[PDB]
Amino acid sequence: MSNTLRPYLNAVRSTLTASLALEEFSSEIVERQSQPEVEVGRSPEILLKPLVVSRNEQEQCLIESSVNSVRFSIRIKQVDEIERILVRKFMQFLMGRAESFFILRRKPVQGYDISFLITNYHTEEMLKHKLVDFIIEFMEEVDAEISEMKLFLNGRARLVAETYLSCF
């Protein structure tokens, strides 16, 4: 999908590509340790201002940034309780695999559906123009993925209805 999200995802792509200017940074509060400074927040001068990009009261991105780390968190469309359950569960499979999607958090920040942490090491050892293409191609497709799952849920609600009702 794209054409209704096109204004929004060009704002997110442009914010996120301006945000992903990361660097190696050894921590100022602990010796011989680097830490993702957006996630610890203990030294304020190397944080950048947290920016929101947003289409709607439901659909939003929060972008938080720092000298060696970016945290990106999104709320996606959930217009009925079937999308609340289908989204909330789908993101728990998608974050349950975070060890193999290297940029995922294992938990969202409070009040967001899914959250990403792009650390310096990822922008050194992965293609950072393909990182934002993955974040954006996720935000385009996830509404089509979830809407398709509520079709398959209706399809099984019929399967069991016909199979029960046709043996009287």
Partner 1 sequence: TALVCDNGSGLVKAGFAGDDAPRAVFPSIVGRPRHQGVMVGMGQKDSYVGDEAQSKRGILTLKYPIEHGIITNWDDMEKIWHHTFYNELRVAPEEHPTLLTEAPLNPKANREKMTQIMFETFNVPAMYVAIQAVLSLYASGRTTGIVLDSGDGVTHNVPIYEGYALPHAIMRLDLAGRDLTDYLMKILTERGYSFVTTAEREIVRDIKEKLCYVALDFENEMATAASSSSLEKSYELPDGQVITIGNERFRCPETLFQPSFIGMESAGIHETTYNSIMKCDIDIRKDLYANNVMSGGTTMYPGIADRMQKEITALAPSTMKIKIIAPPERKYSVWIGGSILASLSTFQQMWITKQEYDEAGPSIVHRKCF
Partner 2 sequence: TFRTLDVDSITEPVLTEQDIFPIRNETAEQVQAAVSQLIPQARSAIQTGNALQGLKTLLSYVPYGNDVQEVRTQYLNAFVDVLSNIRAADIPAFVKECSTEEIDNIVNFIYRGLANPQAYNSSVLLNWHEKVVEISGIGCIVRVLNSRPDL
Partner 3 sequence: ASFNVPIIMDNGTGYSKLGYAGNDAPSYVFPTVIATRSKRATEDLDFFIGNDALKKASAGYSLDYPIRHGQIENWDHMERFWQQSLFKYLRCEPEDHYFLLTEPPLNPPENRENTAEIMFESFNCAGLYIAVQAVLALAASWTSSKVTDRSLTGTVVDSGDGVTHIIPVAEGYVIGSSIKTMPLAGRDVTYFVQSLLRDRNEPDSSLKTAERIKEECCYVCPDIVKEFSRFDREPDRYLKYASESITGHSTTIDVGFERFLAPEIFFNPEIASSDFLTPLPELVDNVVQSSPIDVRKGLYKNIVLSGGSTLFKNFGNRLQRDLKRIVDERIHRSEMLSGAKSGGVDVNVISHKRQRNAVWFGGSLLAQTPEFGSYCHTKADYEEYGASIARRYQIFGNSL
| Touching partner 1, residues 69-98 (CB under 8 A) | 77, 79-80
Distance CA 23, CA 78 (A): 36
- Residue 29 binding result from partner 1, partner 3, partner 2, none, given CB thresholds of 5 to 8 Å by partner type: partner 2
Using alpha carbons, select from 77, 62, 58 the residue that is nearest to residue 16: 62
Give the number of other CB atoms < 10 A from CB of residue 123: 19
- Residue 166 binding result from partner 1, partner 2, partner 3, none, given CB thresholds of 5 to 8 Å by partner type: none
Residue 73 β-bridge partners:
62, 115
Q: Give, in degrees to the nearest 5, the angle at Cα 138 between 153 and 53.
A: 115
Choices 14-22, 102-110, 114-122, 131-139 (CB under 8 A): range interacting with partner 2: 14-22
| Touching partner 1, residues 18-47 (CB under 8 A) | none
Contact footprint for partner 2 (CB under 8 A): 7-8, 10-11, 14-15, 17-19, 21, 29, 42-45, 48-49, 51-57, 60, 65
